[PDB]
Design an enzyme around this catalytic site. Structure first.
Site, PDB file in Angstrom:
ATOM      1  N   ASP A  13      73.972  34.430  63.059  1.00  0.00           N
ATOM      2  CA  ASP A  13      74.264  34.170  64.371  1.00  0.00           C
ATOM      3  C   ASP A  13      75.563  33.292  64.448  1.00  0.00           C
ATOM      4  O   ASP A  13      75.809  32.270  63.996  1.00  0.00           O
ATOM      5  CB  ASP A  13      73.238  33.359  65.049  1.00  0.00           C
ATOM      6  CG  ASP A  13      72.073  34.008  65.324  1.00  0.00           C
ATOM      7  OD1 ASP A  13      71.749  35.326  65.262  1.00  0.00           O
ATOM      8  OD2 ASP A  13      70.926  33.150  65.769  1.00  0.00           O
ATOM      9  N   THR A 221      56.862  38.952  78.396  1.00  0.00           N
ATOM     10  CA  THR A 221      57.378  37.474  78.462  1.00  0.00           C
ATOM     11  C   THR A 221      58.400  37.468  79.706  1.00  0.00           C
ATOM     12  O   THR A 221      59.121  38.555  79.892  1.00  0.00           O
ATOM     13  CB  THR A 221      58.018  36.947  77.296  1.00  0.00           C
ATOM     14  OG1 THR A 221      59.005  37.760  76.863  1.00  0.00           O
ATOM     15  CG2 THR A 221      56.855  36.799  76.273  1.00  0.00           C
ATOM     16  N   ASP A 255      61.355  34.597  70.208  1.00  0.00           N
ATOM     17  CA  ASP A 255      61.071  34.791  68.833  1.00  0.00           C
ATOM     18  C   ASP A 255      59.871  33.473  68.603  1.00  0.00           C
ATOM     19  O   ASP A 255      59.075  33.652  67.876  1.00  0.00           O
ATOM     20  CB  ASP A 255      62.281  34.619  68.024  1.00  0.00           C
ATOM     21  CG  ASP A 255      63.016  35.989  68.391  1.00  0.00           C
ATOM     22  OD1 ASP A 255      62.342  37.010  68.572  1.00  0.00           O
ATOM     23  OD2 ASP A 255      64.224  35.920  68.005  1.00  0.00           O
ATOM     24  N   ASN A 281      53.270  29.830  75.094  1.00  0.00           N
ATOM     25  CA  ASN A 281      54.198  29.409  76.178  1.00  0.00           C
ATOM     26  C   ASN A 281      54.608  27.914  75.760  1.00  0.00           C
ATOM     27  O   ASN A 281      55.681  27.742  76.228  1.00  0.00           O
ATOM     28  CB  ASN A 281      53.466  29.442  77.559  1.00  0.00           C
ATOM     29  CG  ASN A 281      53.728  30.884  78.203  1.00  0.00           C
ATOM     30  OD1 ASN A 281      54.526  31.592  78.055  1.00  0.00           O
ATOM     31  ND2 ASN A 281      52.773  30.957  79.474  1.00  0.00           N
ATOM     32  N   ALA A 290      66.178  22.474  73.632  1.00  0.00           N
ATOM     33  CA  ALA A 290      66.928  22.158  72.824  1.00  0.00           C
ATOM     34  C   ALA A 290      68.005  23.194  72.378  1.00  0.00           C
ATOM     35  O   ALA A 290      67.555  24.465  72.248  1.00  0.00           O
ATOM     36  CB  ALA A 290      66.284  21.398  71.743  1.00  0.00           C
ATOM     37  N   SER A 296      66.128  24.642  67.233  1.00  0.00           N
ATOM     38  CA  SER A 296      64.960  23.795  68.408  1.00  0.00           C
ATOM     39  C   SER A 296      63.514  24.323  68.330  1.00  0.00           C
ATOM     40  O   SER A 296      62.764  23.899  69.137  1.00  0.00           O
ATOM     41  CB  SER A 296      65.643  24.450  69.730  1.00  0.00           C
ATOM     42  OG  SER A 296      65.383  25.970  69.807  1.00  0.00           O
TER      43      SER A 296
HETATM   44  N1  LIG Z   1      63.201  28.326  81.174  1.00  0.00           N
HETATM   45  C1  LIG Z   1      62.185  28.234  80.582  1.00  0.00           C
HETATM   46  N2  LIG Z   1      61.312  27.216  80.758  1.00  0.00           N
HETATM   47  C2  LIG Z   1      59.865  27.289  80.118  1.00  0.00           C
HETATM   48  N3  LIG Z   1      59.670  28.245  79.132  1.00  0.00           N
HETATM   49  C3  LIG Z   1      60.665  29.249  79.013  1.00  0.00           C
HETATM   50  C4  LIG Z   1      61.839  29.320  79.805  1.00  0.00           C
HETATM   51  N4  LIG Z   1      62.535  30.690  79.337  1.00  0.00           N
HETATM   52  C5  LIG Z   1      61.805  31.105  78.093  1.00  0.00           C
HETATM   53  N5  LIG Z   1      60.690  30.069  78.164  1.00  0.00           N
HETATM   54  C6  LIG Z   1      59.308  30.325  77.089  1.00  0.00           C
HETATM   55  O1  LIG Z   1      59.803  31.458  76.322  1.00  0.00           O
HETATM   56  C7  LIG Z   1      59.098  32.545  76.369  1.00  0.00           C
HETATM   57  C8  LIG Z   1      59.963  33.567  75.877  1.00  0.00           C
HETATM   58  O2  LIG Z   1      60.599  34.133  77.226  1.00  0.00           O
HETATM   59  P1  LIG Z   1      61.788  35.192  77.147  1.00  0.00           P
HETATM   60  O3  LIG Z   1      61.128  36.259  76.251  1.00  0.00           O
HETATM   61  O4  LIG Z   1      62.340  35.528  78.621  1.00  0.00           O
HETATM   62  O5  LIG Z   1      62.919  34.660  76.119  1.00  0.00           O
HETATM   63  P2  LIG Z   1      64.272  35.310  75.533  1.00  0.00           P
HETATM   64  O6  LIG Z   1      64.267  34.936  74.035  1.00  0.00           O
HETATM   65  O7  LIG Z   1      64.307  36.651  75.929  1.00  0.00           O
HETATM   66  C9  LIG Z   1      65.600  34.223  76.401  1.00  0.00           C
HETATM   67  P3  LIG Z   1      67.280  34.546  75.912  1.00  0.00           P
HETATM   68  O8  LIG Z   1      67.969  35.808  76.945  1.00  0.00           O
HETATM   69  O9  LIG Z   1      68.375  33.301  76.431  1.00  0.00           O
HETATM   70  O10 LIG Z   1      67.235  34.664  74.257  1.00  0.00           O
HETATM   71  C10 LIG Z   1      58.611  32.565  77.698  1.00  0.00           C
HETATM   72  O11 LIG Z   1      57.242  33.268  77.831  1.00  0.00           O
HETATM   73  C11 LIG Z   1      58.251  31.160  78.125  1.00  0.00           C
HETATM   74  O12 LIG Z   1      57.058  30.655  77.500  1.00  0.00           O
HETATM   75 NA    NA Z   2      62.400  38.478  72.421  1.00  0.00          NA
HETATM   76 NA    NA Z   3      66.572  26.398  72.208  1.00  0.00          NA
END
Ligand SMILES: Nc1ncnc2c1ncn2[C@@H]1O[C@H](COP(=O)(O)OP(=O)(O)CP(=O)(O)O)[C@@H](O)[C@H]1O
Ligand code: NA
Ligand code: NA
Ligand SMILES: Nc1ncnc2c1ncn2[C@@H]1O[C@H](COP(=O)(O)OP(=O)(O)CP(=O)(O)O)[C@@H](O)[C@H]1O
Ligand code: NA
Ligand code: NA
Lengths: 310, 317
Positions: A13, A221, A255, A281, A290, A296
């Site tokens: 990354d 999610t 992930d 969750n 983090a 994190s």
């Molecule tokens: N602002 C937030 N507060 C609390 N939990 C969160 C959060 N954003 C994500 N999560 C947790 O992480 C899970 C994964 O969310 P999502 O799949 O939207 O993440 P992602 O990996 O697509 C975010 P990014 O686009 O920044 O990589 C959610 O189901 C929830 O449990």
């Molecule tokens: Na994902």
């Molecule tokens: Na993080």
């Protein structure tokens, strides 16, 4: 014996933090840059490992510095590298990530050695795959290789967890029928169904489309809104909220969620889905508080004990 | 031993991904190739001068990280002194993340990182190298106050100042003009700096005169395939220095090649007319546009016609 086998991707990354995304032709300045260990496969495997799972990472990296560093990373996380291969014919995969703190990201993946993981490489892992509890795959390796890993898992009664990420609009229909648990995010659900997902209700409608393509369980999610789940036995969607927190960096939260899910499918198979998802969750929400992705992801020791009881 | 060309400026790791389309917000896309390259305007300029045979010194700051170590080795491989190439644990090596589609359009995210931590104390320790050089070269990829201080140091030591206001900002401190012996920018930079449109050599001449009157001694506007336009306080009527048609493969970094060449000529061929210097610099930059990959396209003396190194006037190379 490894209970969780991940057949999937490792990427370096290359992350730039900015306050806006660039438009075409445009140069913008970010305020920080860092290198991390990524890839959806490895990220998922790392979270599962840190929760206490015995894991095995089936993947391919380069015979290059970044690949050597990747292998050491996996070992530092107590992940078996028995079937972590190195090739001189492609470089370790790369994910360039621009994270706009003021909205959506852009990611460019050059998958490199990930795309050289082939069906011969899986065959050597046949005994490990068949003795596992859960097989986890994504779409960062050759789709035919993920399909074969799912097929191998199904033949030994091993639970299949599939994450169609990044999503392809014309996904092979076998991905649905070989998935015991099919877990994606809102934007992926849109790509896969052609529907808009702006609400828990909308996610429920997209999940039902996916369910009818033959998944046993579908989970979408929803970021700060947690997730929504339905299944063949219980097709009514349930909205499971997540922990209310102040997000520092949500990159890789999905992930973390999926790795947690793998951990619970493997080691706590009798829990209700709604219980597993509450716990997953909670874990993923710890990750968002983090910076980074893998750095994190919480360890069992830092998490409330109730997450490990039954 | 003494460096004749000192560059106080930027080093950046280029992280390049080639894709078939650019990503829109929220999108993950696959590219088909990724590679790492050595960039930063300061280092690019320093490299071209060094390859022409200049004794150079690169005053800059990178990270205490692997990209930074690699950058240092790159500078050494080009025979550039790294005596005042600093490394800091407080920020990463500067980065340019570049996504390029099939048609050649791009998006770029720069994190200047350790470049911004190059400070006036760092320059003070480099005082002996700055003050004994022939030419000092700066750009706008480090903190502007640091480049201003480099220019002030060079001026008081009688070292010729070559300033490249790149990337350009509209509201540039007026001291950048008054400290500049040679002020060199491109057409789009000139437009930012003056508000005027530059669509012609004549237009470039008008923009250049606005810049001259802010206190530059010499103003050069580069014009891509149209060569350059130049004027000076002693000869304020602009001259157009055209360049022969070549087949461009990749123009990325041509301006840096131009500026590094000019620094080489200012330092080692001081008795050539300015127009001769700029004719030779055009040729050298144009060689760079005939090959891929920025620093890797910059020619060495051995790759160049010998007429570029003649001590007396020579027009056709
Ligand atoms: N602002 C937030 N507060 C609390 N939990 C969160 C959060 N954003 C994500 N999560 C947790 O992480 C899970 C994964 O969310 P999502 O799949 O939207 O993440 P992602 O990996 O697509 C975010 P990014 O686009 O920044 O990589 C959610 O189901 C929830 O449990
Ligand atoms: Na994902
Ligand atoms: Na993080
Ligand atoms: N197509 C071409 N043919 C011949 N010479 C060229 C050329 N493009 C550029 N050059 C040479 O390179 C010099 C610098 O070109 P230019 O005006 O493009 O600056 P630049 O490289 O800073 C633009 P940018 O910041 O958009 O990349 C020109 O003055 C000329 O000598
Ligand atoms: Na330039
Ligand atoms: Na070039």
């Amino acid at each position: 014996v490894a209970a969780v086998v991940v057949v999937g991707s490792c990427m370096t990354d290359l992350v730039s933090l900015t306050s806006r995304l660039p438009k075409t032709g445009e140069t913008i300045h970010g305020h920080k840059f860092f290198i991390g260990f990524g890839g959806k496969g490895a990220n998922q495997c790392v979270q599962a490992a840190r929760l206490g799972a015995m894991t095995s990472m089936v993947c391919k990296v380069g015979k290059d510095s970044f690949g050597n560093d990747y292998i050491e990373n996996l070992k530092q996380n107590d992940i078996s590298t028995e079937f972590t291969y190195q090739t001189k014919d492609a470089a370790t995969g790369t994910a360039s990530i621009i994270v706009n703190n003021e909205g959506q990201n852009i990611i460019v993946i050059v998958a490199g050695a990930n795309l050289l993981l082939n069906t011969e490489d899986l065959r050597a892992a046949a005994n490990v795959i068949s003795r596992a509890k859960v097989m986890v795959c994504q779409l960062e390796i050759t789709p035919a290789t993920s399909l074969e890993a799912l097929t191998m898992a199904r033949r030994s009664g091993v639970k299949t967890l599939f994450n169609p990420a990044p999503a392809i609009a014309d996904l092979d229909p076998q991905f649905y029928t070989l998935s015991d648990v099919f877990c994606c995010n809102e934007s992926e659900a849109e790509i896969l169904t052609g529907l808009t997902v702006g609400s828990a209700a909308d996610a429920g409608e997209a999940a039902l489309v996916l369910l009818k393509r033959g998944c046993q369980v579908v989970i979408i999610t929803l970021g700060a809104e947690g997730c929504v789940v339905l299944s063949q036995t219980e097709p009514e969607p349930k909205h499971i909220p997540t922990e209310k927190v102040k997000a520092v960096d949500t990159t890789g939260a999905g992930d973390s969620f999926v790795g947690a899910l793998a951990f619970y499918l493997a080691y706590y198979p009798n829990l209700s889905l709604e219980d597993m998802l509450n716990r997953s969750n909670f874990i993923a929400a710890v990750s968002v508080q983090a910076a980074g992705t893998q750095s994190s992801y919480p360890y069992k020791k830092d998490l409330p004990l109730t997450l490990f009881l039954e």
